[PDB]
Structures are given as C-alpha cells and as structure tokens.
Write a protein that binds this ligand. Structure first.
Ligand SMILES: [Cl-]
Ligand SMILES: [Cl-]
Ligand SMILES: [Cl-]
Length: 129
C-alpha cells in the first residue's frame, strides 16, 4: 500500500504516535516519507547483510527476523514480512520500541538528516486529524 500524506498522519495518530516520547506527528510522517516514500512494501538491503522493511524501514539486524540475517536479534518478536502489510500496526508498535531504546528518532538515518531541525509540522498541514 502507498499511503497519502494525511491518510498516514491519521493512521499513525489513531495508533498513538502523535507526541509519542515527545515526537510530534509531523516527525513520524516526515521519517515515513524519506524512508519508504509512504510505501508499506519498501525493502532495502544494507551492506552488512540485514534488510530494512516497510514504511519506517525497520532493520532485520535488531528488530525483526527475515530468516537470512545471521546471528541477528528479533527485539520486536515479529516476522519482518509483517512490516510490509497495508495495516501499519506491527510497524507502529515496533517503531514505539525502537524510539524508546534511548536514541529516540536518531535511530532513523533519514529522519536525522532530512527531518531533524526542520518545520515537520508542514507534513500534517491541511490534514483533518
Ligand atoms: Cl508536528
Ligand atoms: Cl541506512
Ligand atoms: Cl539520509
């Protein structure tokens, strides 16, 4: 599924991401945009051999099990394939564990480089939330 800008803002708001650990909704929509371009089916292989899955590109090294990331952890206790679904529940719930692990949204390389220090509120502007 490819989400529209506001459709995803509402999906994430409904799932309790708005101001989760102090990260406003704008931050989450911005990260989703530059990580996946709002496509739940996005996959990217890292150089180490792990793969990033879905709308927030959760890494198979730490967070999910894809059966081919050797010696890796599964800290969200989920099949990586559960993060490609048009239902963003697994991605959101696992995202909540990632952002709580001490480094906040600095976990997301695209957020840190393209969303941090910008007017993220613009990513929800004109949405009925
Ligand atoms: Cl915001
Ligand atoms: Cl990366
Ligand atoms: Cl980046």
């Amino acid at each position: 599924k490819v989400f529209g800008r506001c459709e995803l803002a509402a999906a994430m708001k409904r799932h309790g991401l708005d101001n989760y650990r102090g990260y406003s909704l704008g931050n989450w929509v911005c990260a989703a945009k530059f990580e996946s371009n709002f496509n739940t089916q996005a996959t990217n292989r890292n150089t180490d051999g792990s793969t990033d899955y879905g709308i927030l590109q959760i890494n198979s090294r730490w967070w999910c099990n894809d059966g081919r990331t050797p010696g890796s952890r599964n800290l969200c206790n989920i099949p990586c394939s559960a993060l490609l679904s048009s239902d963003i529940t697994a991605s959101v719930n696992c995202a909540k564990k990632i952002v709580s692990d001490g480094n906040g949204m600095n976990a997301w390389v695209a957020w840190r480089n393209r969303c941090k220090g910008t007017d993220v509120q613009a990513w929800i502007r004109g949405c009925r939330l």
